[model samples]
Target chain A: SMTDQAFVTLTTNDAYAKGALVLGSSLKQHRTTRRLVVLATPQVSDSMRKVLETVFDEVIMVDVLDSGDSAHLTLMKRPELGVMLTKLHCWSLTQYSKCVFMDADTLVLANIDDLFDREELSAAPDPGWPDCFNSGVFVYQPSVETYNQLLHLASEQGSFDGGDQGILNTFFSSWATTDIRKHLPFIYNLSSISPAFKVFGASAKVVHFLGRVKPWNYTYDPKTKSVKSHPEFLILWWNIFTTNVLPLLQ
Target chain B: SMTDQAFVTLTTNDAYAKGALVLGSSLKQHRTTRRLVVLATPQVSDSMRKVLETVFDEVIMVDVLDSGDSAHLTLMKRPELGVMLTKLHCWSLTQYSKCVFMDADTLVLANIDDLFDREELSAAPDPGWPDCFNSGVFVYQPSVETYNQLLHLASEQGSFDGGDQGILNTFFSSWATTDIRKHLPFIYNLSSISPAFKVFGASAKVVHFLGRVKPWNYTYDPKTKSVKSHPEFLILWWNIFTTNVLPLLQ
Candidate 1:
């Protein structure tokens, strides 16, 4: 079962590649039995790709421009939606029976291989809208049919918020009210914006650095012994980077 | 079966009395088969009580200072928690086998009699934190033991947010992750703060005026022209108030 499942992530650039490396390092640190995989965009630097390869079990390069004609045309019209197309590529990983896709900006705080027990489109409620799920972390079955369907959906409606979250929520419309089991606990994908984090952050299994600012954006000073305006989770991210990922890069 | 189940609301003042009157009118307009009940404090004016009597099957007047020795002592120490104490009295309505508690500020857009099918502690997630159910609308079974236990909880722990939502959330700690059926769809108790209101508000069954601002706060203009900068739902509230609740006052 562990061999047939994976923990997947995506990175669009060198900055996100650093985040992916740190995320993979955290998963390994927690001793996950599932495979660690990263889908990196061509924009990511070669050095960062090498670092990602060292950390992740498989570092697959995804090309946004290589999508189907309809998806490409839709992306041409609304170029901003290309990121969603790239994120949707995880559904094409048919080699794995099921996979938990976490955004590069998210960090694993605990061993979460239990996420495999969930069905397709299983995710935590979005902090902004409790009905629509946050796509930052989710458990989905890998299928070529689902991948093609998502591509078709992307071409037809595009996305409401111009991102993967909107299209995925639209695709999985019944996720809100249909089944309670499909709704993962907030601890699985606790957003940086959630007020629950103040009291319940101690129990967070996965911390998603939502919004524009990410963990990699913060500079960690090693010798001076301080991080610039660091939140505890961000510091935790940097700590993993320094301990595990940084050694591989060196 | 319908006679043993009730739709309950609470009002501490005349402002909320107007809200309760409109809520009762809405339930009646939708043709609910169950009884409608309101728990009023002594502060509610006599005329308002008569109006409440006209709308609800029972207008139960509850006194805060008359609680048991320990509860009274706790209320004396934390006067602000008195509202939560008053809310806890709904649990004492053992005459009703089961009840759906809708806050005074909530409006029913459609028939919600199906809510009785849900068990005790069924409520929609709070917009601020999806993990905690909003106290604005919930399904519960009345029990003296649960009431005494809640009063005991109030005496010992106080409340995290100094309100019923916090204490009720603490009392029903397993609500978030234990069972999906207990998690009422957000449409059942959609908050004014939720971003989903923009798109899915059309399907909203009950709308909660979540913050300090309430529907009755706006003065409706009959002869002049329109309400003062009204949102559509607020205008709908005033429409129901004018059409149904206003005639009762005269």
Candidate 2:
């Protein structure tokens, strides 16, 4: 537990960097007292790096391609799994004792600062197949040893979904079946408004913008879904973009 | 100009190969005399290549990035343009004098052999926005010089709509003003079954599947908009897809 209070995230490309900026800003606007950090790949443009630094306390440049996990090499053999393997490099952030891995494609809704208190393997169950946790968000402790062990596990088991979620979920195979408390409320990493069972037709906390249509793909249609909006945090993410982030790095 | 009397097509990936396979067979079912050819990338699966070889007259691999077009490099610089730029590779195929660049996703109906005589750069109007032409279905000429020049135009103007059709429309700007003959009738590549303007709706000879849905996205609803049972061509498209192409490929 080295950097116990550090809150960290990762981005493999410039596109993901945009989401990271909002993650950091939203946390800060919520009055988070902890340090905010972003890990980025070299392929991300200089412009993207600049915006990342503005909101995050540190924007560390790192290569996502070279992960310590052996499962990565096995996963690399399946090039389609490149995205999941790319994000798995987050565990290489050894500086943090406990870290929250928010995917670059997701944005925080409220102050999820309490997420740090959760145990190392906490995450919301995936809505698609409730047995498996969605890889988009998770809580973890950074250790090169654990990262490698996970990779070894990945090489042996292989991912059902071809991503870190599969390997991690398999490693913590007993988490879902054995423990009831480890499960976080769906609000923490909520994926959609249209539920699998339509339990709550339109309520979600953290919007995991995963799939074919994204806000950036087309103008956000508020009429289509209820996107959480508090007036205080309106402009922070409204028009907040790479511009606020660009100048801070240099 | 070599395969003008026969069938010719280009595929960039194996996923698209599925679309091309179904499309080629649809045309063949209508008793086309032309040969079916596919220009592909090395990434296409060996199995997909074999399937395409069985269905098409020839299968050629084209190295798009190395084609030495400077605009290809510029478009590559803006990698979001990759998908569309890859669509542009069809231009480099100088093997056929007049070729129809049918998106691997489109299905052909009736005998479209007459497209060969329609001249190069003729395409269907975009179903979403009719004033603009859809890039998916078009009749083109094979010319290395035209290909290089179009790539250059892409670098300079980058296509107003960020598609090959937009670039072709802007480059082939004279179609509207210079010659009425170049403006091929909408029937040549009719897309969109909906009657945007009723006067032209029922008379549609060719159908274009457009917007948020494609033929594959949904099971066809026979009774929508007073249009009961989609056109015979669309039903034929599904039949070939389910019976001939899917089974043969599987």
The number of the candidate with the highest DockQ is 1
Off by over 4 Å in 1: A67-80, A192-199, A217-230, A241-244, B67-80, B192-195, B217-230
Give DockQ for candidates 1 onward, in order: 0.46, 0.01
Give the alpha carbon lDDT tens digit for every residue of A1-250 in model 1: 3788999999889988888888999999999999999988779888778878898999987877766433565677668787788788899888899999999998998999899889998999887578889899999999888988988778877666767877788789998777778989988988844234556768889888898888778777998554775267877888888888878856
Best by lDDT: 1
TM-score of chain A of 1: 0.92
Kindly report the docking quality category of candidate 1.
acceptable
Candidate 2 lDDT by residue in tens digits, B142-224: 77788777777777766544456667766776543233344445555555453122333444434555444445544644455
Error of 1 at B39 (Å): 0.8
Per-residue lDDT tens digits for candidate 1, residues B76-96, read: 867778778888889999989
Residue-level lDDT for A92 in candidate 2: 70
